Amino acid sequence: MPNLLLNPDIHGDRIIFVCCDDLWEHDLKSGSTRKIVSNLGVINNARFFPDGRKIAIRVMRGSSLNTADLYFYNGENGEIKRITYFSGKSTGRRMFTDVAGFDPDGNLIISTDAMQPFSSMTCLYRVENDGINFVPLNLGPATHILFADGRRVIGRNTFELPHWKGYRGGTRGKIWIEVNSGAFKKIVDMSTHVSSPVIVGHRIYFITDIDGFGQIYSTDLDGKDLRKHTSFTDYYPRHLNTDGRRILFSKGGSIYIFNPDTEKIEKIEIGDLESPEDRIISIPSKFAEDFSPLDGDLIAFVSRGQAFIQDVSGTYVLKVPEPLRIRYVRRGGDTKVAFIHGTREGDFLGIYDYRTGKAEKFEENLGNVFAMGVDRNGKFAVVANDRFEIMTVDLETGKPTVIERSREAMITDFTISDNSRFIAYGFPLKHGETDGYVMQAIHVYDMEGRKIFAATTENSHDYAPAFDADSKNLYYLSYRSLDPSPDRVVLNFSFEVVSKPFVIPLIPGSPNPTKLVPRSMTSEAGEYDLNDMYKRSSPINVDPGDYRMIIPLESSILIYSVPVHGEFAAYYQGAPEKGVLLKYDVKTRKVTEVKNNLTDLRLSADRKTVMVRKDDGKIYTFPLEKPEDERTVETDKRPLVSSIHEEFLQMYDEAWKLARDNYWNEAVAKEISERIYEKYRNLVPLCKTRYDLSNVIVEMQGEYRTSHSYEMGGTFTDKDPFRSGRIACDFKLDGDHYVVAKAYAGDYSNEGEKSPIFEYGIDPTGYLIEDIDGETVGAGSNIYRVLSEKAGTSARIRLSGKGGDKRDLMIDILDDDRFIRYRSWVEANRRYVHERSKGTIGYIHIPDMGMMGLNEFYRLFINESSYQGLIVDVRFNGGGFVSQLIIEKLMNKRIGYDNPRRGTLSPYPTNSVRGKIIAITNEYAGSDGDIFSFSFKKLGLGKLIGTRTWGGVVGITPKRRLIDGTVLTQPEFAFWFRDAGFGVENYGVDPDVEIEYAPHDYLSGKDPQIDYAIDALIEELRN
Amino acid sequence: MPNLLLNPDIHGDRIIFVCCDDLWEHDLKSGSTRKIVSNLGVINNARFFPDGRKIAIRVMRGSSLNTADLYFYNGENGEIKRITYFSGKSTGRRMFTDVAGFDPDGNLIISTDAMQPFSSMTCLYRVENDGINFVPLNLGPATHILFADGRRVIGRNTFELPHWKGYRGGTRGKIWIEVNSGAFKKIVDMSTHVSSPVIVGHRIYFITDIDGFGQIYSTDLDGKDLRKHTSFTDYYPRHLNTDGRRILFSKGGSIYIFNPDTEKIEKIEIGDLESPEDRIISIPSKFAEDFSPLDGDLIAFVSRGQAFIQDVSGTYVLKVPEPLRIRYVRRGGDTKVAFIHGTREGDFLGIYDYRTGKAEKFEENLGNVFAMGVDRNGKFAVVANDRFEIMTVDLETGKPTVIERSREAMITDFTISDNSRFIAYGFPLKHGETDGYVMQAIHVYDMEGRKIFAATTENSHDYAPAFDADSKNLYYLSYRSLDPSPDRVVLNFSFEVVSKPFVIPLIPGSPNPTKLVPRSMTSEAGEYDLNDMYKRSSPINVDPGDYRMIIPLESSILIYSVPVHGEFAAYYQGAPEKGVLLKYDVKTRKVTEVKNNLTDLRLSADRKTVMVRKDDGKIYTFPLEKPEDERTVETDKRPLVSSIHEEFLQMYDEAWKLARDNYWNEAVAKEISERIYEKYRNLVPLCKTRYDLSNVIVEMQGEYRTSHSYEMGGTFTDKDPFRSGRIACDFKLDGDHYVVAKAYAGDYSNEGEKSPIFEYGIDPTGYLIEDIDGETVGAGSNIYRVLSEKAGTSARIRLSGKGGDKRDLMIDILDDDRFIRYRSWVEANRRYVHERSKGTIGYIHIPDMGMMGLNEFYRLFINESSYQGLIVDVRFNGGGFVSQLIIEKLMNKRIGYDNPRRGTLSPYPTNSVRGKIIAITNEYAGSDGDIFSFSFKKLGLGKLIGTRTWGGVVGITPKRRLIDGTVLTQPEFAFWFRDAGFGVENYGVDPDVEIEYAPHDYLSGKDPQIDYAIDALIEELRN
């Protein structure tokens, strides 16, 4: 059982590399190997210093390796020391904050965005005093910095891209070079991506897959004389590193060597190194899901692919006796529960009796199940697959019977009548193969006569169907109560609270039960008749809002309400939505609160037990009759047990299946999948850590050669994320004191947009930081570290300005100051554009096409839209989906005015740009950012200035995760531009005018992109 | 900066050893070193298998390394695997559950007490199927098992004893040997302790300090031909281990080699290996203490030697700017706090103003301070030292002035009048230099006239003095309200609730304020007169109970009550005592509850703020006027920061000082201390882990050559303790199924004394365990592991007995079953003694001389005391202090009877033993156990049978701990037996008849000690 070796570095006979997240050293001479450093978290890069004595190491921390920082290793005394306290943000695809290289003097040059507004601004910094001070090289963003003959060699976006093989977009790795002690020239700019550059002698060796596969090449210090050296076919080579003599690298999990002279490729022998305990223990709550209430006051829940029947206490627990991957568990009888078991083949229905033991599992495939339920009389079950089908499976025989198939989306919202006769469900529809919206009409299926009826019309969104106990009327919710709500910032209106409940008696002639129509004055007791029942529909007198569930009770109705709120947290942090359980008494027609702070709710089949999760993450349970009596559902009593190798295989196959099942093009999928499966499956057994699995999985995802194949979430370590103390400032070591080199601030009156020092009425810029919380900082005291240890609290900071000016304030040491830096940048550029255009041009910047973008666009769109000209800077735009909405705005043309008796003119439309517009874009703007760029030109809103953009317009919508919480993504929505097709994908967008931003432009402190834009508009504004 | 190397093992050129809790391997040949295993917790022993390929490792877990288990290491593939799930209990002095040796076949033999009733029964077991099955060798308790010429060599109690150099007690390490394929003979039994035995050729090499220091010796396989090989003088050698050729060992932190042939000693070169981050982060709550409320609703508290001023929230925190070791912090003004700083020299008073910054620290030494307080007007402070002095320190000048010095105990209970004029305190006294009890009388000191007065008489215990706001009357509590409470088991009575409050008006003529004597009917307003004030004393009408504090308020009085409760938990688990704050309204004379679940309480100087800790460990704070409004005091917001090397030095010096300051003999102390200081201080800088420090400290404690020098508590790891699933049963692998070899049970009707399976009315013995919680256990499934994973929960266990008998019950998987095994043993021996003496002899066993002992003694004393003869088995007795109480019982002689008209005779006394008594004792009974043994003979209660006992009769009473919570102990109370002196110490007690318990006696399954006892009594019972 060998390991998965990777990311090596060489120096003489010694060779360091990574295995099991730890760092190892190998001596070709003796042939021995040893672990030189461990227990620091997950390590992915280790670099030999010039002398070959010390080693710079990049280690990641946080459950999902969302944070990272650099460490030093002295192989002389075995000393270990943290160098940076930046807590750089990183993801699988962009593992920023690493070693850039070493300067001639033998000093370490790092690449980080810790002090930058945009993650992609991984600017270069020279490390001094072991992390005490940091001197910027002002060469702009870079991933590698080599030196040759006194010439700086810069590698841009030159990190590996395993997730996207054959990438040819604008963010492809490129190489520049110095020519005139300050002048730079781009020398390697192939059609494909260039990664991991090295210089042996006077040639730069790098990797690219221009020929269709990853190989090693080289060229003189002028990007000329290209040569193809290796000819691999098994796995792409990665992580090139050298010592000046030979080149080192990794492939398919082994460490190889390439001698530039001999041009010979040889594999290093290392054999087995480490085989940790395969049987691991996990905490059920960390991976729990699908919590459901059963009879006898029991509970059912799924975790890490396993299922359990336990009591609220968590003291008596039973595991369902079934192999890996239980997707769903559902009450199917007094002591019987029905489950959904998934395998590489698909999803299958199962049944288990936690009393006897009988667990006969079916074999009839159901495809990819996403919803499952069982009638109250354990006769059959209802299932929804990704084929958009809703079906009934005979819980006795196992024969699934398709009832109806939607052609727009899955039928996951359904309910069964208590008498097991009707099945009401939401049926997504469209009235055209290209409609912009998808309607949803409730459908009712009758088990007798086997026929479908329309409970609702197909003009809006009707959902949450639910029958009453006696099964006499069908209740449901709908967004039909249209009534606009005003926007407090932008002239606009939205449908905020347009949800309302309705009812439909299954017996014609019977009135709305909530209308309290005296029995003596009605003549019900007719007979079921579901024909044209959508005509008998009636609403229930309850104020419009945002309802997600309706539960009909004897003399009351429970409703789940979701108060209006922003979507920022939900969009970026996946933060759960907050609701509250409301009660409506039919008699009194009064509403009340039953339970708040709910983020999820489930209800028993008997309607007597309620199970819910609150905003605190915990799960509770209480009787509907006495909601005051809730208990906490504990599950962390019994350890969760599993096998790494069994889970890793399971996880690989699922990742491999989703990638295949969700790829936008089914054809390409059948081929790529079938051609990459085995190849990458053989590496799984070499994996010992979640990080090992990641390497295998990502490389296999790259085999689809498309954008948006990401891997997020998942548990990679038990190490806590790195902390970084921030006060929105820039420090500089000058003598024996740290000086406030810069004090970031954007809109003083906005929230969280300035150095917390400003609250004390003083701009820290220029002042000298004496000490923090008593401890003196400076020449012999790392301020970065001290601040790190105070992150998230308030500390006393003694400062000193001009003269005898001395301050001693309680400052809030923030955990992050990115946004403050972003806003600072935007406001700077905004001030710049005004002054240079003599107050005739506006400025607006769009960070992404998500909630934040929407925020930033409108934040300035309301003050900048009425200038002679407008600059819509969309550089570094991270994509999203709201581009269409922003374009729609800019699309407006001013065609009139309103003349008031008093006041100023009112432009019509209001959201109309006054004059000429111009867009700025770089290679760091992609996805929706790609779409926005192409559109801006295509619609002729103005000229596009900058550099070709990213080029990944195949959207995604993940709907399933791995048993460890990992959320993988698959390019499922290919964007097709009219008169261009899918051309944008794997290419990007070409600006009308290309304005490069060379390393020398950064050294001169000039932005050639924004300058051109401004100067260009002034020219157009001469008319 | 080198490391502290230790506990090595050798094999050829390779040499494994421990450094920084991790295991390392060194190759003499190449001279290189590497860490072969880490992150398992703290490792102290590593043993090479025969083939030299695999390695057995013993690792400890739990904050205080209170738990341990064994792991395997395959140097071929680098596989790691946990072998045992016993969760063996261990302490610094007795690190049980380790590798005993290897049998001829190359199998691992382990020594553990996991399945034994007494910790000292570290019986031998052969490991099979990598921990699947365990086969007992039935050779009795052993620490080492070697083999030579087909002869078993057993080493009893042969582990190292660094804490007690020159130990010559009965538990001293000894060596036995087989002579007749079943017959054993003791061969090495020197006067001193023999540790770490090895066999090179045909000689056993071990270590002993018979010459006054640790050295290596050897003798033929007959304990003959003694030879002294080494002649060290720097540090004792430890952990001998060999491969058959050369011997390996450690000394003063280095690894050495000894060649039996050459007889040459050589040091192995290893140099620096690991130097972790010196700056560590700790959690304040984990080491907090001395929490105190200040003004402005602020809080003060001490942790890990540091002090802080923070708000209840813990958001605004200030550290007191003072070097290590702040013992106490006390409010001394609006923004000023007084503190007690400790150094190697002693304790000193200090003052800090968290507003300005002025922190002038005094230099006048105060000795060892244990109580400190400041008047309400920040003029002076009151201090109590271990010299038994109470003094006033001028908070301005610094001049301490001794007021009074007790000669019995410290004066820690004192209070200052609000007007700063009187100082009331408890003054411990005796009316004889040999009295059995120490009385305590409240004393009052007047700052004006400077004279002491007697507030109370010296006939009992008067405490908790407290003045009223106006400083007109002095309140206090006393245990004078004598009134006996009946014992529900043993004919006895105790003073349970005899506490009551009293008051003393400082102005003669003034009545008891609580008596509500109409002002119009009294003529107070006299003048202070403290003369014969103890005559004016008066009680306050409040029911007797167990009060710890009394707080006089305007029209009410607060009293801290402690409901009667057992002391088991408090005695063994140090569990805090539970109290409740009560309120007494002077007017209504009615009592009420203010706050419960309190385990500690503090009160502001203004009597308006209350700070308390509840049984949940958290700290709260609430206004006395509105006790319903309490907030939680948080402190874990700001990380606690420190330096390992600065703390380690601090901790060493303190451990070194306490050891010196508390040794029973001052003379011996001055010499030993001064002679061992530097020698062990030079090792501190080599320490990197708490375990490294422990090694140094323990060795230095051993330099006192006395018993009771222990080291408990302290934080050694962040690893959670090992878990062990137990159901009071013994399993045996038979084929492919585990069989219940034994089902332990003691008194079926008592609590926690039988296998939880019994509750289902079935004796598991004989049955076959099929599966647990679904998972099948047996040949290919470690039941020990499975049970471990269900510890502390209830699991479904399928069993199978004779015929088609099959059970399926929900069993409680316990975390431990020691007590159930102990009770089983006692009951077995009890049943045995009855049957063999034909029902004429009783049996009683005393496990220790603590609360449990008291429990077990009376548990059987009431049914066994009236037989013709009695056996008081006190083997394995762990000591304590209640021996005197048990003797007093047995001391009773039956001299009469009560003849009833109906019923049976009543013996007088009731607690009188009917006839002849006989005691059984082994080397595993010590301390009070030692005292009991000597006494039993000395008083002639009967004969003593067994083997010489432990020999450590120098008691301890720790009263101070290290900044990391570590609790060190120092032999402070030397026991002097009349007509024998201190002879018992370092020797033990000699039984009238010596009955050894050889290994062959265990193999025959016979107890020669209990047999002799029974047979001997029958002989005496012939009269």
SS3 of A24-61: the string is EEEECCCCEEEEEECCCCEEEEEEECCCCCEEEEEEEE
- Using DSSP, state whether A216 is helix, strand or coil: strand
Alpha carbon separation from B291 to A313, B221, B308, B613, B621 (Å, rounded): 35, 62, 10, 9, 11
User: Given its phi and psi angles, is residue B7 left (phi above 0), alpha (psi -120 to 50 degrees) or beta?
Assistant: left
- A residues 20-39 near B, CB within 8 Å? 30, 32, 34-35, 38-39
* B956 is known to lie in a ligand binding site: yes
Pairing of the two strands B737-743 and B729-734: antiparallel
Q: At a CB cut-off of 8 Å and minimum separation 6, what does B300 contact?
A: B290, B291, B292, B293, B294, B307, B308, B309, B329, B330, B331, B337
Give the A:B interface size as CB pairs under 8 Å.
Answer: 86
What are A973's strand-pairing partners? Answer: A955
Distance from CA of B62 to the nearest CA of A (A): 17
Please check whether residues B63 and B170 belong to one and the same domain. Answer: yes
Lookup: tokens for A609: 């037990």
Please, which residues have CB within 8 angstroms of residue A200's CB and are 6 or more apart in sequence? A218, A242, A244, A245, A246, A247, A260
CATH number of residue A977's parent domain: 3.90.226.10
Tokens of B798: 């399928």
Query: Does A878 appear as a known binding residue?
Result: yes
> Given an 8 Å threshold on Cβ–Cβ distance, is A793 in contact with B637?
yes
Q: What angle do CA A190, A195, A198 make, to 5 degrees?
A: 105
SS3 state at A705: coil
- Length in residues, chain A: 1023
| Rounded distance between C-alpha atoms, residue B271 and residue B273, angstroms | 6
Looking at residue A192, the DSSP 8-state letter turns out to be S
User: A690-701 and A644-662 are packed helices; what angle lies between their axes, rounded to 10 degrees?
Assistant: 20
The residue behind tokens 């302790």 is B193
Q: Which among B927, B935, B972, B1000 is annotated as catalytic?
A: B927
Residues 6+ apart with CB under 8 A from A734: none
Angle at B559 between CA B558 and CA B562, to 5 degrees: 150
Which of A714, A739, A763 is the last residue in one of the domains?
A714
**Same domain? B320 vs B469:** yes
In whole angstroms, give the CA distance from residue B685 to residue B678: 12
- B417 to A545, A773, B374: CA distances (angstroms): 65, 37, 11
Helix (H, G, I), strand (E, B) or coil at B980: coil
Q: Which residue, among B678, B679, B672, B667, has the nearest Cα to B709 in the 3D structure?
A: B672
Do the Cβ atoms of B642 and B684 come closer than 8 Å? no
Give which of B42, B77, B356, B798 to mutate to test A binding, by max A Cβ within 10 Å.
Answer: B77
Contact status, residue B348 vs residue B366, Cβ threshold 8 Å: yes
Nearest to B756 by CA among B726, B786, B723, B787: B726
User: A760, A787, A817: which is the final residue of a domain?
Assistant: A817
Residue ending a domain, choose from B714, B733, B759: B714
* CB contact at 8 A, B651 and B693: yes
Q: Do A35 and B30 touch (CB under 8 A)?
A: no
Contact criterion met (CB below 8 Å) for B198 and B188? no
* Contact by Cβ (8 Å): A289, A303: yes
* The token pair that represents A136 in the structure block: 């910027």
Nearest alpha-carbon partner for B674 in B656, B658, B662: B656
Are residues B77 and A39, on separate chains, in Cβ contact within 8 Å? no
User: A338 forms bridges with which residues in the sheet?
Assistant: A330, A351
- Write phi, then psi, for B874 (nearest 5 degrees): -120, 20
B303 counts as catalytic? no
Measured distance CA(A671)–CA(A649) in Å, rounded: 21
Rounded Cα–Cα distance for residues A70 and A99 (Å)? 8
Closest CA to A862 of A826, A913, A933: A913
Annotate A51-115 with DSSP letters as a single string: TSSEEEEEEEESTT--EEEEEEEETTTTEEEE-----EE--SS---SEEEEE-TTS-EEEEE-TT
Residue A901's CB is within 10 A of a number of other CB atoms, namely 4
Cis amide bond preceding B909, omega within 30: yes
Closest Cα partner for B528 from B443, B468, B446? B446
Residue A880 marked in a binding site = yes
Select from B81, B276, B315 the Cβ nearest to the Cβ of A277.
B81
**Annotation-wise, does B878 bind a ligand?**
yes
If 0-12 CB within 10 Å is exposed, 13-18 middle and 19+ buried, where does residue B332 land?
A: buried
A847 in the same domain as A789: no
Residue B701 CA: distances (Å) to CA of A135, A954, B194, B705: 52, 71, 19, 8
Q: Give the span between the Cα atoms of B162 and B485, in whole angstroms.
A: 47
Does A277 fall in a domain? no
Cβ-based neighbour number of residue A269 at 10 Å: 11
A336: β partners: A353
Task: Tell me how far apart the alpha carbons of residues B559 and A503 are, in angstroms, rounded to a whole number.
Answer: 64
- The answer to whether residue A583 is domain-embedded is yes
CA B550, CA A692: separation in Å to the nearest integer? 65
Instruction: Give the count of beta carbons closer than 10 Å to the beta carbon of residue A720.
Output: 11
How far apart CA A218 and CA A225 sit, in angstroms, is 8
The burial class, CB within 10 Å (0-12 / 13-18 / 19+), for B890 is buried
C-alpha distance from residue B917 to each of B841, B948, B989, B1015 (Å): 9, 19, 18, 13
Q: How far is CA A306 from CA A51, A327, B229, in A?
A: 52, 9, 62
Total domain count, chain A: 5
Alpha helices in A703-801 (DSSP H): 783-788
A503 and A573 fall within a common domain: yes
Compute the distance between CA of residue B108 and CA of residue B72 in angstroms, rounded to an integer: 10
Taking CA atoms, what residue in A is nearest to B316?
A794
- CB B155 within 8 Å of CB B146: yes
Do residues A800 and A823 share a domain? no
Quote the CA–CA distance of B947 and B950 in Å, as a whole number: 10
Query: Searching chain B, which residue's CA lies closest to the CA of residue A638?
Result: B790
3-state secondary structure of A389: strand
Both structure tokens of B231: 């002649």
φ/ψ of residue A934, rounded to 5 = -60, -45
Report d(CA B908, CA A550) in Å as an integer. 79
* A279 is a domain residue: no
The two structure tokens encoding residue A844: 């607006």
Q: Which of A71, A641, A771, A776 to mutate to test the interface with B (most CBs of B within 10 A)?
A: A641
H or E segment and range at residue A654? helix A644-662
Q: How far apart are CA A171 and CA A163, in angstroms?
A: 14
With beta carbons under 8 A apart, name residues in chain A contacting B31: none
> CA-CA distance, A392 to B150, in Å (whole number)?
74
Annotated binding-site residue? A956: yes
Give which of B445, B441, B467, B466 is closest to B456, Cα–Cα: B441
In sequence order, the β-bridge partners of residue A582 are: A559, A593
Torsion of CA B134, B138, B143, B149, to 10 degrees: -100
Distance of CA B96 to the CA centre of its chain: 16
Among candidates A135, A17, A94, which has minimal Cα distance to A711? A94
Q: Which residues in B lie closer than 8 A to residue A637 (C-beta atoms)?
A: 792-793
- Shortest alpha-carbon distance between residue B597 and chain A (Å): 22
Q: Tokens 């905490």 — which residue? A: A283
Residues B761 and B872 both lie in one domain = no
Cβ–Cβ under 8 Å, residues B244 and B202: no
Is the Cβ pair A276, B794 closer than 8 Å? no
Task: Identify which of A329, A326, A300 has the alpha carbon closest to the alpha carbon of residue A312.
Answer: A300
Question: B376 CA to chain A: closest CA distance, Å?
Answer: 29
Q: Cβ of A805: how many Cβ atoms within 10 Å?
A: 11
B940 CB near a chain A CB, below 8 Å? no
**B642's tokens:** 């420190």
Maximum separation of any 2 CA atoms in chain B, in Å: 104
Q: Is residue A677 part of a domain?
A: yes
Determine, for residues A641 and B774 on separate chains, whether the beta-carbon distance falls below 8 Å.
no
Beta bridge partners of A870: A842, A917
CA angle B350, B356, B360 (to 5 degrees): 25
Please indicate whether, in this complex, the C-beta atoms of B277 and A82 are within 8 angstroms of each other. Answer: yes
CATH number at residue B681: 3.30.750.44
**Token pair 């997504």: residue:** A428
Closest residue of B to A642, CA-based? Answer: B789
Q: Do B227 and B242 form a contact (C-beta atoms < 8 A)? A: no
Q: Gap positions in chain A, given as the residue before each gap (C–N > 2.5 A)?
A: none
Whether A36 and A158 map to the same domain: the answer is yes
Range of the domain at B802: 723-817
Q: Are residues A193 and A63 in the same domain?
A: yes
Q: Do the domain assignments include residue A495?
A: yes
Query: Do A77 and B774 lie within an 8 Å CB cutoff?
Result: no
Could A793 and B35 be called an inter-chain contact, meaning their C-beta atoms sit closer than 8 Å?
no
Q: Which of B821, B823, B799, B820 is nearest to B809 (CA)?
A: B799
Instruction: Give B6's strand partners.
Output: B18
DSSP 8-state assignment for residue B893: B
The shares of helix, strand and coil residues in chain A, as percent rounded to the nearest 5, are 15, 40, 45
**Is the separation of the CB atoms in A252 and A234 below 8 Å?**
yes
Backbone dihedral angles phi then psi of residue A256, each to the nearest 5 degrees? -115, 165
Q: Quick check: is A283 in a domain?
A: no
DSSP element (H, E) containing A818: helix A818-836
- Which token pair is A127? 């490390």
Note whether residue B279 is domain-resident.
no
Q: Is B927 a catalytic residue?
A: yes
Is B804 assigned a ligand-binding role in the annotation? no
Q: How many CB atoms lie within 10 A of CB A561?
A: 22
Find out whether B483 and B496 touch, Cβ atoms under 8 Å. Answer: no
Please tell me the distance in Å from A356's CA to the nearest CA on chain B. Answer: 10
Triad A123, A126, A131: Cα angle to 5°:
110
- The single residue listed with the structure tokens 């040999």 is B434
8 A C-beta contact, residue B197 and residue B158: yes
Q: From residue A298, give the alpha-carbon distance in Å to each of A360, A373, A609, A724, A813.
A: 22, 17, 10, 45, 47
Alpha-carbon dihedral angle through residues B218, B220, B224, B226, given to the nearest 10 degrees: -20
**Exposed, middle or buried by CB within 10 Å (0-12, 13-18, 19+), for A630?**
middle
* Secondary structure class of A832 (helix, strand, coil): helix
A139 and A6, same domain (yes or no): yes
Residues B793 and B903 in one domain: no
Instruction: Output the furthest CA–CA distance in chain A (Å, rounded).
Output: 104
- At B45, list the tokens: 């022993």
Q: Taking CB atoms and an 8 Å cutoff, what residues of chain B touch A314?
A: 793
- The DSSP call for residue B578 is P
At A323, list the tokens: 């192999």
Do residues A104 and A199 make contact, with C-beta atoms less than 8 angstroms apart? no
In angstroms, the Cα distances linking B951 to B94, B158, B659, B708, B927 are: 16, 17, 20, 10, 7
DSSP-based three-state secondary structure for B509? coil
Other Cβ atoms within 10 Å of A864 Cβ, number: 21
Q: Are A954 and A974 in contact (CB under 8 A)?
A: yes
Kindly give the residue spans of alpha helices, DSSP state H, lying in B627-766. 644-662, 666-681, 690-702
Residue A278 lies in a domain: no
Domain co-membership, A971 together with A919? yes
Please tell me what resolution, in angstroms, this structure has.
2.8
| Adjacency order of strands within the sheet including A942-946 | A841-845, A869-873, A916-921, A942-946, A993-994
CA-based nearest distance B328→chain A, Å: 20
Query: How far apart are alpha carbons B240 and A278 in whole angstroms?
Result: 34
DSSP characters over B273-290: --B--SEEEE-HHHHEEE
The 10 Å Cβ neighbour count of residue B961 is: 17
Output the six-digit token pair for A951: 């080029």
> What is the number of other CB atoms lying within 10 angstroms of the CB of residue A133?
19
Please indicate, yes or no, whether residues B823 and B799 belong to a single structural domain of this protein.
no
Q: Which residues contact A455 (CB under 8 A, 6 or more apart)?
A: A424, A441, A442, A443, A444, A462, A465, A474, A476, A504, A530, A533, A534, A537
Put simply, the answer to whether A277 touches B785 (Cβ < 8 Å) is no
The C-alpha atoms of residue A619 and residue A631 are separated, in whole angstroms, by 9
User: In angstroms, how far is CA A784 from the centroid of its own chain?
Assistant: 28
The angle, 0 to 180 degrees and rounded to 10, between the axes of the packed helices B644-662 and B690-702 is: 20
CATH number of the structural domain spanning residue A194: 2.120.10.60
Q: In sequence order, what are the residues at sequence separation of 6 or more whose Cβ sits closer than 8 angstroms to the Cβ of residue B115?
A: B86, B123, B730, B821
Burial of A1004 (0-12, 13-18, 19+ CB in 10 A): exposed
Interhelix angle for A666-681 vs A690-701, to 10°?
140
Query: Strand locations in B506-576, DSSP E?
Result: 538-539, 547-552, 556-561
Q: Which amino acid type is present at position B310?
A: Q
